[PDB]
């Protein structure tokens, strides 16, 4: 897969993020992952763990997968990275994200995932506690 240039428009929660993509404004969905949403255990950790990851970043890459690039909704389905760190895996390593959504064609990065995932669960993190 190839990483690609955005800037950062808005954090909006733990798995969603405006960014400015090819010119344009586009609502980014995080591939093979689910935050809880706000208004649920762990969504203002999320929400702000995300926010964090990516109002620091000083360079914001996303990374589409070999299938669907935009869901249903019109966002884009992807990994994103905030200097070289995919916010993705970074989720769930921290317990905040739980391995999800997982469709045949856009899981090139399922292993590394599940991977931190099994990291975050025997550390009893956050959503494992
Ligand atoms: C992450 C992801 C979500 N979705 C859709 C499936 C779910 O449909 P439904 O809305 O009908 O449940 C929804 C969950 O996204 P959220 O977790 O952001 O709600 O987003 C995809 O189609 N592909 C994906 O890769
Ligand atoms: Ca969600």
Same mark, same amino acid.
């Given at each position: 897969l190839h990483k690609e240039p955005a800037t950062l428009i808005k954090a909006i929660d733990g798995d969603t993020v405006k960014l400015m993509y090819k010119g344009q404004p586009m609502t980014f969905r995080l591939l093979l992952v689910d935050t809880p949403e706000?208004?649920? &255990? %762990?969504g203002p950790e999320a929400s702000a763990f995300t926010k964090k990851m990516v109002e620091n970043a000083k360079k914001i890459e996303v990374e589409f997968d &070999?299938?669907?690039?935009?869901?249903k909704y019109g966002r884009g389905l992807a990994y994103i990275y905030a200097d070289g760190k995919m916010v993705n895996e970074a989720l769930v390593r921290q317990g905040l #994200? &739980? +391995? #999800? %959504? +997982? %469709?045949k064609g856009n899981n090139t990065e399922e292993q590394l995932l599940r991977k931190a995932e099994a990291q975050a669960k025997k550390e009893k993190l956050n959503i494992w506690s």
């Amino acid at each position: 897969l190839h990483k690609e240039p955005a800037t950062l428009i808005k954090a909006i929660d733990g798995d969603t993020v405006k960014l400015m993509y090819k010119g344009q404004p586009m609502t980014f969905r995080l591939l093979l992952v689910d935050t809880p949403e706000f208004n649920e &255990k %762990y969504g203002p950790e999320a929400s702000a763990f995300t926010k964090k990851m990516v109002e620091n970043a000083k360079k914001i890459e996303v990374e589409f997968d &070999k299938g669907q690039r935009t869901d249903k909704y019109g966002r884009g389905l992807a990994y994103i990275y905030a200097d070289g760190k995919m916010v993705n895996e970074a989720l769930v390593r921290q317990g905040l #994200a &739980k +391995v #999800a %959504y +997982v %469709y045949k064609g856009n899981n090139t990065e399922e292993q590394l995932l599940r991977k931190a995932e099994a990291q975050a669960k025997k550390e009893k993190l956050n959503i494992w506690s």
